[PDB]
Amino acid sequence: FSVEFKATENEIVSGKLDADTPAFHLVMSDSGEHKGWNVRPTGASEGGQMVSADGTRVDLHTNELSWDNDHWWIDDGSERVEATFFLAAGDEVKAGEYQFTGRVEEYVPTVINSKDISATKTV
């Protein structure tokens, strides 16, 4: 069981986005038998937002995972799942360094593995 979560390399400049803009990339893997994964936002990120130091909250979205009220999830039994979190076109993105904190969970439902994730994306 390993997890990789990091900010993307594309530069974001403040203002009103025209397009879906990549912000973080996630990799969740385990050779063990499993049903799927949760990605649960934690702390300030509750609600599924990245949050800057001045308290600006920006929505995260992904096309690789589903969403259930307050968390991403997917049924995927393969050894490895990748996801990109992006900012939707049309959102205004203001000042600073935006942190997302979360907890990744592997389930079979019973959770059999869990790990904190954290990364900071610059605007």
- Positions in the binding site for ligand GAL (CB under 6 A): 38, 68, 73, 75, 107, 109
Measured CA to CA, the distance from residue 97 to residue 58 in angstroms comes to 11
Minimum CB distance to ligand GAL smaller for 1 or for 73 = 73
- The strand order across the sheet containing 21-29 reads 2-7, 21-29, 80-87
Comparison of 81 and 93: residue with beta carbon closer to ligand GAL: 81
Q: How far is the CB of 109 from ligand GAL (least distance, A)?
A: 5
Q: Which is nearer to ligand GAL, 34 or 121 (CB)?
A: 34
Residue 93 beta carbon to ligand GAL: minimum distance, rounded to whole angstroms = 28
Comparing CB distances to ligand GAL, the nearer of 89 and 108 is 108
Q: At residue 44, what are phi and psi to the nearest 5 degrees?
A: -60, -30
- CA 62 from chain centre, in angstroms, equals 8
As measured in angstroms, the least distance from the Cβ of 36 to ligand GAL is 6
Residue nearest to ligand GAL according to CB distances in the complex: 68
Q: What b/e sequence results for 72-82 when a residue is b if at least 16 CB atoms lie within 10 Å of its CB, and e otherwise?
A: bbbeeeeeebe
